[PDB]
């Protein structure tokens, strides 16, 4: 894609690295607990206003060579066109054409 979307996705990745730690321990555990301090878990729900991008749900799996937001494969980290032309040169180990 454009350079702005790859720059946009790197930012999201970067932020999430920082708050991934911060969030789950304090907020999610408190929100799910059975003790459920009514006052304190309510306080942290208001406190869940950190940068939105720092959420891991905002990450879009793009191709690591082009940035395609569609046709992704988590096995290779690439798009459909890129994994086809990389597999055809034998640049991916054990990847040959399937027939059964």
């Amino acid at each position: 894609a454009k350079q702005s979307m790859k720059a946009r996705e790197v930012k999201r990745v970067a932020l999430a690295d920082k708050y991934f730690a911060k969030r789950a321990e304090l907020k999610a555990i408190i929100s799910d607990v059975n003790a459920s301090d009514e006052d304190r878990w309510n306080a942290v729900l208001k406190l869940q206003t950190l940068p939105r991008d720092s959420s891991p749900s905002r990450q879009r799996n793009r191709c690591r060579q082009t940035g395609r937001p569609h046709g992704f494969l988590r096995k290779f980290g690439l798009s459909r066109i890129k994994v086809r032309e990389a597999a055809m040169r034998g640049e991916i180990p054990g990847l040959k054409k399937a027939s059964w």
Binding site: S31, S36, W41, N42, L45, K46, L47, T49
Partner: peptide, 12 residues
């Protein structure tokens, strides 16, 4: 329900 109503801190 268990999480409770969601409000925006700025709006509140």
């Amino acid at each position: 329900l268990k999480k409770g109503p969601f409000i925006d801190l700025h709006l509140l």
